[PDB]
Design an enzyme around this catalytic site. Structure first.
Site, PDB file in Angstrom:
ATOM      1  N   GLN A  19       0.799  -1.223   0.000  1.00 53.53           N
ATOM      2  CA  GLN A  19       0.000   0.000   0.000  1.00 53.53           C
ATOM      3  C   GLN A  19       0.848   1.299   0.000  1.00 53.53           C
ATOM      4  O   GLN A  19       0.321   2.393  -0.226  1.00 53.53           O
ATOM      5  CB  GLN A  19      -0.969  -0.033   1.186  1.00 53.53           C
ATOM      6  CG  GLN A  19      -0.294   0.034   2.548  1.00 53.53           C
ATOM      7  CD  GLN A  19      -1.275  -0.151   3.709  1.00 53.53           C
ATOM      8  OE1 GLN A  19      -1.479   0.768   4.495  1.00 53.53           O
ATOM      9  NE2 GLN A  19      -1.865  -1.333   3.822  1.00 53.53           N
ATOM     10  N   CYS A  25      -5.201   0.142   3.582  1.00 53.73           N
ATOM     11  CA  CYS A  25      -5.345  -1.288   3.899  1.00 53.73           C
ATOM     12  C   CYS A  25      -6.754  -1.808   3.584  1.00 53.73           C
ATOM     13  O   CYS A  25      -6.920  -2.918   3.053  1.00 53.73           O
ATOM     14  CB  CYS A  25      -5.008  -1.552   5.364  1.00 53.73           C
ATOM     15  SG  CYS A  25      -5.988  -0.608   6.546  1.00 53.73           S
ATOM     16  N   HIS A 162      -6.589  -1.890  11.592  1.00 51.96           N
ATOM     17  CA  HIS A 162      -5.947  -2.374  10.368  1.00 51.96           C
ATOM     18  C   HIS A 162      -6.845  -3.428   9.709  1.00 51.96           C
ATOM     19  O   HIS A 162      -7.492  -4.220  10.400  1.00 51.96           O
ATOM     20  CB  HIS A 162      -4.561  -2.956  10.685  1.00 51.96           C
ATOM     21  CG  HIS A 162      -3.739  -3.279   9.480  1.00 51.96           C
ATOM     22  ND1 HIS A 162      -3.495  -2.367   8.475  1.00 51.96           N
ATOM     23  CD2 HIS A 162      -3.110  -4.422   9.111  1.00 51.96           C
ATOM     24  CE1 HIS A 162      -2.761  -2.941   7.534  1.00 51.96           C
ATOM     25  NE2 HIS A 162      -2.510  -4.186   7.897  1.00 51.96           N
ATOM     26  N   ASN A 182      -1.463  -9.681   4.353  1.00 50.50           N
ATOM     27  CA  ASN A 182      -1.309  -8.253   4.629  1.00 50.50           C
ATOM     28  C   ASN A 182      -1.029  -7.498   3.309  1.00 50.50           C
ATOM     29  O   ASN A 182      -0.959  -8.120   2.238  1.00 50.50           O
ATOM     30  CB  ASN A 182      -0.216  -8.045   5.676  1.00 50.50           C
ATOM     31  CG  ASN A 182      -0.433  -6.802   6.527  1.00 50.50           C
ATOM     32  OD1 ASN A 182      -1.224  -5.917   6.187  1.00 50.50           O
ATOM     33  ND2 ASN A 182       0.288  -6.733   7.651  1.00 50.50           N
TER      34      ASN A 182
HETATM   35  C1  LIG Z   1      -4.918   0.733   6.905  1.00 52.72           C
HETATM   36  N1  LIG Z   1      -3.906   1.145   6.282  1.00 52.72           N
HETATM   37  C2  LIG Z   1      -5.375   1.577   8.013  1.00 52.72           C
HETATM   38  N2  LIG Z   1      -4.560   2.577   8.444  1.00 52.72           N
HETATM   39  C3  LIG Z   1      -4.974   3.410   9.429  1.00 52.72           C
HETATM   40  C4  LIG Z   1      -4.016   4.498   9.902  1.00 52.72           C
HETATM   41  C5  LIG Z   1      -3.538   5.336   8.735  1.00 52.72           C
HETATM   42  C6  LIG Z   1      -4.706   6.019   8.062  1.00 52.72           C
HETATM   43  C7  LIG Z   1      -6.256   3.242   9.965  1.00 52.72           C
HETATM   44  C8  LIG Z   1      -7.087   2.219   9.460  1.00 52.72           C
HETATM   45  C9  LIG Z   1      -8.455   1.925   9.985  1.00 52.72           C
HETATM   46  C10 LIG Z   1      -8.880   0.596   9.950  1.00 52.72           C
HETATM   47  C11 LIG Z   1     -10.134   0.244  10.431  1.00 52.72           C
HETATM   48  C12 LIG Z   1     -10.534  -1.203  10.411  1.00 52.72           C
HETATM   49  F1  LIG Z   1     -10.403  -1.696   9.221  1.00 52.72           F
HETATM   50  F2  LIG Z   1      -9.762  -1.876  11.233  1.00 52.72           F
HETATM   51  F3  LIG Z   1     -11.745  -1.383  10.842  1.00 52.72           F
HETATM   52  C13 LIG Z   1     -10.972   1.222  10.965  1.00 52.72           C
HETATM   53  C14 LIG Z   1     -10.567   2.550  10.983  1.00 52.72           C
HETATM   54  C15 LIG Z   1     -11.499   3.554  11.608  1.00 52.72           C
HETATM   55  O1  LIG Z   1     -11.121   3.970  12.670  1.00 52.72           O
HETATM   56  N3  LIG Z   1     -12.691   3.909  11.133  1.00 52.72           N
HETATM   57  C16 LIG Z   1     -13.542   4.885  11.863  1.00 52.72           C
HETATM   58  C17 LIG Z   1     -13.899   4.281  13.232  1.00 52.72           C
HETATM   59  N4  LIG Z   1     -15.027   4.977  13.863  1.00 52.72           N
HETATM   60  C18 LIG Z   1     -15.656   6.162  13.274  1.00 52.72           C
HETATM   61  C19 LIG Z   1     -15.511   4.443  15.134  1.00 52.72           C
HETATM   62  C20 LIG Z   1     -13.243   3.425   9.874  1.00 52.72           C
HETATM   63  C21 LIG Z   1     -13.420   4.582   8.923  1.00 52.72           C
HETATM   64  C22 LIG Z   1     -12.399   5.515   8.776  1.00 52.72           C
HETATM   65  C23 LIG Z   1     -12.576   6.592   7.913  1.00 52.72           C
HETATM   66  C24 LIG Z   1     -13.763   6.711   7.200  1.00 52.72           C
HETATM   67  C25 LIG Z   1     -14.774   5.776   7.343  1.00 52.72           C
HETATM   68  C26 LIG Z   1     -14.604   4.702   8.214  1.00 52.72           C
HETATM   69  C27 LIG Z   1      -9.304   2.901  10.517  1.00 52.72           C
HETATM   70  N5  LIG Z   1      -6.612   1.406   8.496  1.00 52.72           N
END
Ligand SMILES: *C(#N)C1=NC([C][C][C])=[C]C(C2=[C]C(C(F)(F)F)=[C]C(C(=O)N([C][C]N([C])[C])[C]C3=[C][C]=[C][C]=[C]3)=[C]2)=N1
Length: 215
Positions: A19, A25, A162, A182
């Site tokens: 990525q 991810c 993640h 991954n």
């Molecule tokens: C991958 N790469 C990755 N990287 C990051 C850090 C760098 C940006 C964060 C995330 C991520 C994964 C997930 C998952 F898949 F595990 F569920 C969830 C989130 C996340 O926190 N979201 C919001 C959570 N809440 C509002 C409670 C999901 C999300 C994020 C942005 C827009 C819509 C939904 C982050 N993966």
């Protein structure tokens, strides 16, 4: 369900991707699940476009994260997703592009796995193919994984940060595991994969936010 499943052995899993400089991810997890269904439906293994998702899934935040369910919903509503070749990965969010001949797969919806239920996840992997899952990947022990069946008692099942792809499951030297693809390149982990503890009280939240696309 079988004791052991490994979709890499059936040719349902594309090469490990990287990525790069983008928190995408979720897009890699989503395309991996789509790629498995496309193989199952058609006999073709090919790279679908994470960039199409990064650029176009407006409910997600591109390189700032997202959910896989939002991606599947987009592919359904959009009436398709492009191939990687048609819509290549650039590792930064750009404007959503339309390629008249780019479509390589379709999606008819999705299903979620009952929250926290590893037996249900196993059954889905066995019946469907690769399944998108979310985990706590924040621990140094995960980030620097190299070998074995990963278990860290400090992993937080409620800190889902993640997105990865469960491509099978099994047992290694008596330790039950999930086979996890991954998207941090082949130089990460074990050729881009990690074996994560299975049936150890939903370690790292592996069954907390699992889903697969319908095709
Ligand atoms: C991958 N790469 C990755 N990287 C990051 C850090 C760098 C940006 C964060 C995330 C991520 C994964 C997930 C998952 F898949 F595990 F569920 C969830 C989130 C996340 O926190 N979201 C919001 C959570 N809440 C509002 C409670 C999901 C999300 C994020 C942005 C827009 C819509 C939904 C982050 N993966």
């Amino acid at each position: 369900a079988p004791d052991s499943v490994d979709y890499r052995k059936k040719g349902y899993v594309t090469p490990v991707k990287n990525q790069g400089q983008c928190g995408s991810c979720w897009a890699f997890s989503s395309v991996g699940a789509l790629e498995g269904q496309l193989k199952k439906k058609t006999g073709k293994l090919l790279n679908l476009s994470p960039q199409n998702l990064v650029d176009c899934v407006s409910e997600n935040d591109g390189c700032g994260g997202g959910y896989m369910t939002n991606a599947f919903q987009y592919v359904q509503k959009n009436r398709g997703i492009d191939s990687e070749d048609a819509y290549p990965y650039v590792g930064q969010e750009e404007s959503c592009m339309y390629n008249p001949t780019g479509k390589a797969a379709k999606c008819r919806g999705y299903r979620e796995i009952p929250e926290g239920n590893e037996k249900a996840l196993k059954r889905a992997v066995a019946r469907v193919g690769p399944v998108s899952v979310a985990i706590d990947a924040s621990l140094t022990s995960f980030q620097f994984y190299s070998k074995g069946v990963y278990y860290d008692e400090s992993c937080n099942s409620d800190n889902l940060n993640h997105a990865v792809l469960a491509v099978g499951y099994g047992i290694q030297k008596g330790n039950k595991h999930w086979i996890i693809k991954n998207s941090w390149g082949e130089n990460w982990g074990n050729k881009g994969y990690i074996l994560m503890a299975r049936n150890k009280n939903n370690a790292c939240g592996i069954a907390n936010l699992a889903s697969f696309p319908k095709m």
